[PDB]
Amino acid sequence: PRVIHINDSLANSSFGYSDNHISTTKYNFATFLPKFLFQEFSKYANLFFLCTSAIQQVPHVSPTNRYTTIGTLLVVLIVSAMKECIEDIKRANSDKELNNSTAEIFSEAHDDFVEKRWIDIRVGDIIRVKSEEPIPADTIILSSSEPEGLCYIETANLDGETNLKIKQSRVETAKFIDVKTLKNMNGKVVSEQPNSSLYTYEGTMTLNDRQIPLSPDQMILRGATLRNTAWIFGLVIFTGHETKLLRNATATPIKRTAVEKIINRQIIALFTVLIVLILISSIGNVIMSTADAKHLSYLYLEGTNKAGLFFKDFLTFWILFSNLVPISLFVTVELIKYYQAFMIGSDLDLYYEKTDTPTVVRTSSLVEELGQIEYIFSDKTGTLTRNIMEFKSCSIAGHCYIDKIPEDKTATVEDGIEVGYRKFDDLKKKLNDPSDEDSPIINDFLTLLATCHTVIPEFQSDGSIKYQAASPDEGALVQGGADLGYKFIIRKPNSVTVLLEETGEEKEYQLLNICEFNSTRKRMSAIFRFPDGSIKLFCKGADTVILERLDDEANQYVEATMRHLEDYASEGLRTLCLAMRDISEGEYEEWNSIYNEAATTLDNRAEKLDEAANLIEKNLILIGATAIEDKLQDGVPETIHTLQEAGIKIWVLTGDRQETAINIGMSCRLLSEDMNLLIINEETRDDTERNLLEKINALNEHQLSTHDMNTLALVIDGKSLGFALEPELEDYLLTVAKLCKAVICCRVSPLQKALVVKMVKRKSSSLLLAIGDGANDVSMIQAAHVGVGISGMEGMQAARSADIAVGQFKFLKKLLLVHGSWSYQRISVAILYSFYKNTALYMTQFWYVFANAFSGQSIMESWTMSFYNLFFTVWPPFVIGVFDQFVSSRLLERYPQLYKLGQKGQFFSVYIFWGWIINGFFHSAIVFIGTILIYRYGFALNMHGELADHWSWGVTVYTTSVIIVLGKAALVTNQWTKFTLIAIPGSLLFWLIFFPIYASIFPHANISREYYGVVKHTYGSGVFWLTLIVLPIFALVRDFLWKYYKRMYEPETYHVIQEMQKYN
């Protein structure tokens, strides 16, 4: 139990509490490298490059330059380090900006409130929060400018909605208004330990000698924001990393994709192959040098030690064969991913021209996941639903009125009871003339709309009045009465003033009593006194409670209103019935004494007041019903339908209550009336366990038909999800959630939005995407494999904290179907090809170790072996991984099931990787054998008996390998634009024009002095051209024929789609 003293801070600071210190920075200037290098060299390619560069520096083992590999390694390490430093600076700037907030602390020196900062606010500082300034820490409210300690707090950070939350002070401590009296109160607060449950709190506060309890009605969290209140006094309990807001938040983990986790195992396998080759070659070398000691006397072999030669040929063969894991691949993959992010963030169909905010990919190293998403976790308001509720329809005097009448049923058929749609103009026309009977009912309706609410209006400098409503339906009712003509204006205590734009006269109503809204009552009653001197009761609530309490002999329009509630409920709109009654003075004089009888019983207040009020709602007269819609964004249902067709499961985690979440789910066509909703709203651990057992036992017993599986949804409450995430009940929730079609989670704290994602990604092996807006779901975006934030709106915390930022929800379709799948098909190939064209050359260096007594001689010049991966084989990988489209965009959008081609991993795996490697080995062996067979004894030239040699043959091997890899690249491409036309034949022409220039100039400058007569002994002979013509075709005929066979007599789905595209 945390014990806190209220006045003496120097006395309560002895326990060692926090100091309001928040930290969002991972690295500092004292331990940046020991962690950055550890997280950088925890991979495998980095360790391999480090070992290779460390071994290459010794003199008598390196055939190539010593600074290229380590140079590029240091360059990429510097790039990563500076990116990380920029991100850390961005975090530290926001942390310092938040830390430099001007608070007001009650100092004993000045004995008054001084303007200090959020830092050094110790546990116990009686602080003052002004009008709209955010709350500094977890503070129990003591008083306010309101008459009875009431206050409104917006909780858009710890929740998701902007509705005003009511808090109040205890009656024993809500009297301290001035500051000079705050020095008199004393005592101690015994509170709970720092936790993460937002909607729960418990504690005691002992003042002079009497103690008062505590509850979440007094606890104000750090993420709140006081509104509609001049000032409040708050005693701080939690601070810093102990507040319930920032104690649930977690750090940012390092995100790795599935392609990376496959590449790591591919690198392990390639390292094992490399070790096998090194061991074979070294054993062969030592065996030959031990056996043929007599026939190798012309080399003056030392033979002094066996290990002294073995541990050196080991290093020589390591440096000779380490090109199997190149670094050009690992820089081109990053360049390709960055260019793909640039291309994604440059499309018009992903541009939202309302807020002028195009999409931006803030982390390219994850775009490859956009083609293999299986789950989608989404927050309700902001992403799916715009936070705008609108009064749509009213039904009074048996009629029904809307402004935008649709033409499907504009003709009211007058089939007995009137059903149809009429304009609001005809509503004003039956309101204007007094001869109609319903006009006292119509204006009594519009006063029940413009008076019964509890909305707090406010004016602006423009004159457009903004209403601050504690519930959005009451605010939409006020705006519906306001644009109809009955504007709601200045609200003083115990009276309501209404400005009437029909007549121009400003009325006023004397508020006698209001009974609060209750979910058990689902009613709201309000007795009023009029300018007439008459006492009238207004009551609004659901039909299932007030329809029992009518006088059917009195009202004549019940049959019209129940059918209007039936076609309103057939569209999923939230409805409310409106009732009224004139009352007399004698029953009001008695019911006032009954209300003061309920004011006398402080022991019972939840039960006494409401049923003391229900004495007077024994009979009412129905006016009619209303319909408030909660409009969604454009294209939400179509995108939900498309993403469910493509095979993606969609969950909805929200901070709202249950009924509105279910209504939104029904409205967006995510749920349906036939879908059996397994609702779990238990309140204890054993009860949730029993509920889960009952659900799973009733599900596994019956046969899971396709219709039953499709028509099944799950709805969980936050208090029950708090127990369903324990290690015991985790499997039950997981197995009951996977059978459903859609899952909804209500009353979910920001921590549970991430706990659910963690549970799903641990208990499975599927990729997750989380799209959201606001701050509460940031912890969610950090937990999912891919994070998406709604941008273009105020408070773009998600747009800054997410990996991708989009304008709205309807783009998430094209981000995943087209740009998502394309990427997965591109980079994957761009990796495999990068493991091919490399090997297909350097494996020749292996087939040569049998023709030189296992020495380690290379057949090409070092500078040419370096230029291989720089000038002649760099453009095919980019033109394949950037500007290649294996299927058109419209066909990817028309057939969503093609997305599954990337969802199960049918483009990149270990099998295809080994296939590419073996094809490279085969091509290398073919080249080597053909070349050594054509150049038998060097006697292959027709120039006065002169012969070829070592380099005049290595050049032919190199040219043949280049032509073969370019032919393979040309066979892999699907479409031939312009970059593909000048990237694959372009490299061939580049080499064929660059070799005669490099070999006729650089030898003079003592740069590669081997090519002194190779131009004439290669370009001047016919055998070179004939080999160039006949060997690549011999090597690529197998691939050509297998491609033809696969596309003709055994096609895949995308093959059929490409065949459709080519002709149709």
Binding site: D292, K294, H295, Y298, Y300, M343, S346, L348, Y351, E353, D356, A851, N852, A853, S855, G856, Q857, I859, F883, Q885, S889, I934, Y935, R936, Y937, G938, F939, A940, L941, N942, H944, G945, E946, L947, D949, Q975, W976, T977, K978, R1009, Y1012, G1013, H1017, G1022, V1023, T1027, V1030, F1034, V1037, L1041, Y1044, M1048, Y1049, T1053, V1056, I1057, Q1058, M1060, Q1061, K1062
Partner: protein
């Protein structure tokens, strides 16, 4: 519209493209064209390789097998030949020995027809790793140009053969230390009314080696021959024994290393006229022992063709490609005709 992306074909990924498709309407004609253009080339190459007539005599083991008195016939496992006619008398050999102890092998063969083509004389070595890592780079490229390189400025690649008894070795490295030093008599002596065939030794190595190999500028009091040149230059160089590697074309030919353990090296040639039919003799000084490396040195007399020598590998590869293309074209044609695909344009599983 400040941050609105541009509306260009490049930025929107809708460039004008051309999608190729592997259809039997264009794949089978391609195989037909390949098989029709690669068979004539292969036939021409095989004809040009067969049109080359040559001869090869493994003159190793001539020390023990050959007869000192009169000529005896060489065993059949040492002779190879390809001519336009038949050989009536097989080649034979003899072992001549001088008074000081130097031996020589005299080969005696017969050319049955007039070879109206340029004649070339090579020596063939086997099991000699000219491409070893410790052997290719072991030579100093500055001494080849003639620059008097000091002892400390000498390249370390000649580490075993780099200076002796505090004296610089002029031809650096192991490439010059181990040189083939068997001398072919620069004439084919005709026997019995057969005229002598005068060969030549000038212009043999590459035209660029006769430009980089220049006469040294060293003085003989500074340099000392390699350990394996001491029999030709006993007790060091002098002011007259110093060789000029500008015209010593055998040295140029030997320095240009080979890529395989079995290689040719041009030694003699003649391009002015032909050698008529008749019996010829060639004398070969036996200095280089084969016990040093364990291979077989041989004397080779060849001509020149379109691809150089008698090698069928190129024509064979052309014919293999053409045959594979024709075979698979026929297979695919019969599979298409007798078994139509009938895939359907709108037949899909989505």
């Amino acid at each position: 519209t400040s941050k609105k992306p541009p509306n260009t074909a490049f930025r929107q990924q809708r460039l004008k493209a051309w999608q190729p498709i592997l259809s039997p309407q264009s794949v089978l004609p391609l195989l037909i064209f390949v098989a029709c253009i690669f068979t004539p080339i292969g036939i021409g190459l095989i004809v040009s390789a067969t049109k080359v007539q040559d001869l090869t005599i493994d003159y190793s083991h001539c020390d023990t097998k050959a007869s000192t008195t009169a000529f005896e016939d060489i065993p059949k496992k040492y002779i190879k030949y390809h001519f336009k006619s038949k050989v009536e008398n097989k080649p034979q050999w003899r072992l001549t020995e001088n008074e000081n102890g130097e031996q020589s092998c005299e080969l005696q063969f017969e050319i049955p027809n007039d070879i109206k083509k340029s004649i070339f004389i090579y020596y063939k070595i086997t099991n000699f790793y000219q491409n070893h890592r410790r052997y290719v780079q072991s030579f100093d490229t500055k001494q080849i140009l003639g620059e008097p390189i000091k002892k400390d400025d000498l390249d370390t690649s000649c580490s075993p053969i780099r200076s002796r008894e505090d004296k610089i070795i002029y031809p650096c490295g192991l490439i010059a230390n181990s040189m083939f030093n068997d001398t072919f008599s620069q004439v084919l002596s005709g026997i019995d009314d057969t005229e002598d065939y005068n060969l030549t030794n000038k212009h043999i190595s590459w035209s660029i080696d006769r430009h980089r190999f220049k006469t040294t500028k060293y003085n003989a009091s500074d340099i000392v021959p390699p350990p394996n040149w001491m029999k030709k230059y006993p007790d060091g160089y002098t002011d007259e024994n110093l060789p000029d590697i500008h015209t010593w074309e055998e040295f140029q030919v030997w320095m240009r290393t080979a890529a395989f353990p079995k290689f040719y090296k041009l030694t003699l040639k003649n391009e002015s006229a032909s050698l008529p039919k008749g019996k010829y003799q060639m004398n070969i000084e036996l200095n280089y022992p084969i016990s040093l490396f364990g291979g077989t040195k041989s004397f080779v007399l060849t001509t020149n063709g379109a691809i150089g020598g008698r090698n069928m590998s190129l024509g064979v590869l052309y014919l293999i490609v053409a045959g594979l293309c024709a075979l698979f074209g026929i297979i695919f044609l019969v599979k298409l005709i007798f078994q139509p695909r009938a895939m359907g344009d709108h037949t899909y599983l989505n």
